[PDB]
Enzyme design. Sequence first.
Site, PDB file in Angstrom:
ATOM      1  N   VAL A  26      26.381  17.830  17.691  1.00 14.42           N
ATOM      2  CA  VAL A  26      26.797  17.473  16.711  1.00 14.42           C
ATOM      3  C   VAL A  26      25.576  17.425  15.607  1.00 14.42           C
ATOM      4  O   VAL A  26      25.562  18.602  14.243  1.00 14.42           O
ATOM      5  CB  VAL A  26      27.167  16.504  15.989  1.00 14.42           C
ATOM      6  CG1 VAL A  26      27.416  15.538  14.379  1.00 14.42           C
ATOM      7  CG2 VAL A  26      28.131  16.378  16.467  1.00 14.42           C
ATOM      8  N   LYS A  42       9.335  -3.751  22.368  1.00 14.67           N
ATOM      9  CA  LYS A  42      10.001  -3.494  22.955  1.00 14.67           C
ATOM     10  C   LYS A  42      10.042  -4.554  24.607  1.00 14.67           C
ATOM     11  O   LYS A  42      10.306  -4.667  25.754  1.00 14.67           O
ATOM     12  CB  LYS A  42       9.280  -1.625  23.439  1.00 14.67           C
ATOM     13  CG  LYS A  42      11.143  -0.952  23.260  1.00 14.67           C
ATOM     14  CD  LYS A  42      10.503   0.907  23.208  1.00 14.67           C
ATOM     15  CE  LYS A  42      10.918   1.688  22.127  1.00 14.67           C
ATOM     16  NZ  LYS A  42      11.233   2.953  22.366  1.00 14.67           N
ATOM     17  N   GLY A  53       0.501  -0.468  22.404  1.00 16.86           N
ATOM     18  CA  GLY A  53       1.764  -0.966  22.266  1.00 16.86           C
ATOM     19  C   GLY A  53       1.643  -1.996  23.135  1.00 16.86           C
ATOM     20  O   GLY A  53       1.840  -2.836  23.083  1.00 16.86           O
ATOM     21  N   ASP A  82       5.467   4.696  29.697  1.00 16.10           N
ATOM     22  CA  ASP A  82       5.905   4.642  28.747  1.00 16.10           C
ATOM     23  C   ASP A  82       6.048   5.983  28.369  1.00 16.10           C
ATOM     24  O   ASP A  82       6.185   6.561  27.202  1.00 16.10           O
ATOM     25  CB  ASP A  82       6.021   3.575  27.360  1.00 16.10           C
ATOM     26  CG  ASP A  82       6.761   3.998  26.513  1.00 16.10           C
ATOM     27  OD1 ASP A  82       8.372   3.430  27.049  1.00 16.10           O
ATOM     28  OD2 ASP A  82       7.337   3.520  25.911  1.00 16.10           O
ATOM     29  N   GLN A 123      15.721  16.619  28.123  1.00 18.56           N
ATOM     30  CA  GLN A 123      14.669  15.588  27.557  1.00 18.56           C
ATOM     31  C   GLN A 123      14.890  15.049  29.203  1.00 18.56           C
ATOM     32  O   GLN A 123      13.201  15.368  30.010  1.00 18.56           O
ATOM     33  CB  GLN A 123      15.133  14.969  27.180  1.00 18.56           C
ATOM     34  CG  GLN A 123      14.459  13.810  26.676  1.00 18.56           C
ATOM     35  CD  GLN A 123      14.667  12.010  26.308  1.00 18.56           C
ATOM     36  OE1 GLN A 123      15.769  11.690  26.504  1.00 18.56           O
ATOM     37  NE2 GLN A 123      13.832  12.906  25.577  1.00 18.56           N
ATOM     38  N   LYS A 136       9.673   3.621  31.599  1.00 21.48           N
ATOM     39  CA  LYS A 136      10.988   4.188  30.914  1.00 21.48           C
ATOM     40  C   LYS A 136      11.587   5.509  31.059  1.00 21.48           C
ATOM     41  O   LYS A 136      10.605   6.053  31.950  1.00 21.48           O
ATOM     42  CB  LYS A 136       9.823   4.671  29.133  1.00 21.48           C
ATOM     43  CG  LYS A 136      10.894   4.700  27.984  1.00 21.48           C
ATOM     44  CD  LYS A 136      11.295   6.812  27.787  1.00 21.48           C
ATOM     45  CE  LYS A 136       9.933   6.526  27.051  1.00 21.48           C
ATOM     46  NZ  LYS A 136       9.951   5.639  26.092  1.00 21.48           N
TER      47      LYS A 136
END
Length: 693
Positions: A65, A99, A140, A222, A234, A262
Amino acid sequence: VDWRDEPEPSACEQVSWFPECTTEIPDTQEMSDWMVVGKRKMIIEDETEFCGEELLHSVLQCKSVFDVLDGEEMRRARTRANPYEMIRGVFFLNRAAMKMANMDFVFDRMFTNPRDSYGKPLVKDRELLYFADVCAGPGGFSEYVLWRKKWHAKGFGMTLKGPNDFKLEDFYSASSELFEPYYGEGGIDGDGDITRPENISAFRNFVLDNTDRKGVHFLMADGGFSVEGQENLQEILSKQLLLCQFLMALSIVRTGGHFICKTFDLFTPFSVGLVYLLYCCFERVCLFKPITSRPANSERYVVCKGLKVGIDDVRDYLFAVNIKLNQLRNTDSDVNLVVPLEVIKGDHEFTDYMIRSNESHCSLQIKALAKIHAFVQDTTLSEPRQAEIRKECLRLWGIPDQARVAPSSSDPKSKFFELIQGTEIDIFSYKPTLLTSKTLEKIRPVFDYRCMVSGSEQKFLIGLGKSQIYTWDGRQSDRWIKLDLKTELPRDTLLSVEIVHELKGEGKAQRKISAIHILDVLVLNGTDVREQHFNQRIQLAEKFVKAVSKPSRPDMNPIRVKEVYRLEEMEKIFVRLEMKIIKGSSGTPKLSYTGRDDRHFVPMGLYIVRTVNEPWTMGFSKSFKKKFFYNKKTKDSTFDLPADSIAPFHICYYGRLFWEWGDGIRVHDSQKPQDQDKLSKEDVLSFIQMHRA
């Protein structure tokens, strides 16, 4: 799609795991036919082996979309539709750290306090926690872990060089010698590409060399990159990244260790087979999406606890598969299978869980995508609950709602007064008692004492973060002097140190290095340890000090703990004394103490430090063949350590003796100008032997 029939936002999250794997770990023989190579496939729409066709197509159309919608105009509706958006990074450098703050709470401190399968922690709070952080956006994850564990954790990081490299200087806590980056082959000169076999092997060797060859307690990965213009592919575009992260887990994670990585969409059998390999290699695996992961994306996390013994065949197999992947780049071929589809589907429990996870995530993501689309087509809509939800999440996870903004541009004197918390400053000015024939009786208990070899005058050292390190010589009149050494240390660190000239080789080829040798510790990175027992302070010093080291940066000044000996074992010290030809001694050999590595330094003497408190002393029971503590006032005796027998830092510092090793003193058999007024090695050893019994 009706997105308004979604469940109410909440801070409460539920987790379900894969069934525990019962089948045996695949070996080299069984996996010898598992790798399938075929045509490179850049189509995702038919990958329905683990997801219903309706859900896959619906999530793909919902993503597409926005192929014609403005990107900024879409992210502005994303900010309004996501009820967990306002959490952001709080006081960390990005939202990715939150996270880990989310998932560390959800998985019961699995990462900040890792346990084993039986409920036993892997690290003694009162030994060092080792972790690795690969493919990290300015670390992080490591910022959270280091802020939560202070000097009680040591981190090894590898990531791609460039604009998304590590930013050590922006960590709320920590330092370069807490989270030590290593970029593959070449060390700190590597590129950090985790998909290169050279970097894989090099980082593995590095991590093993700094973890007693055991590995890290856990690894977090990650990895991700831009897939702009081809977002729907992806998962395929990052298949090799996923494989390399799973392989790094199998390569550096210790037995019983944990691993969180991840992932993205997991529709292809390639990714599902990788998850199946993890499920075979760990004691328990699950697929989880925290609320700090934006609800409209394909991002989720695979959480693995308890690495099994004998996973080396899978490790070698995945290394080989990655090599084949590197060989098929820019060709029409690709590795499309790592585990045969029949083996994956043969496990009904695994396949049931995998399908259910894919489908539930698909439905939630479809609702979130339609929600973003509706918020694009209507800019008045909003979640009126973001503030309260963020507040409740921070309360639940134990994250204080206070910003990073405190550069702590404190001067070393004010920070020293802050760190000593009202302790009298004169305690830091006490000079050691010289060990002479008139003061030899002071070390009479023997067992109450420890000893260490000194190489320079004792100084205090304070760390204000990164290279803002200052030293002070203990006198109220002296100013704090900035340390002219290439080294870094976390803020809120207070040490008792000496600055030693380490030597490697002899004569004209001799290399010299200045090093920080820690004698005792008071505060490290914020938690006070001055009241702990001296050996415990030295062990926490080895914890932090092992953490404050530099194998990837041979350009930095090393930090070490002094070797602490029991006074009844001082004989072991003289065995390490050697007469070596030092550069500039006109050929005269000089007394040298050789450490644990092939480096040596000129000793100035030997400190004797009392570790047992006032009218408390250690004897040796000849009947029980064990040492015991005796209270001189109450006359009680015990074989356990009394809390009040512990000598804190101020007692150890005040009561310390120093046995100088100047001219005329014989401590090595080649140097016998024995001044009869000065204690020799033989005198001290004889006194110690007479008073061991």
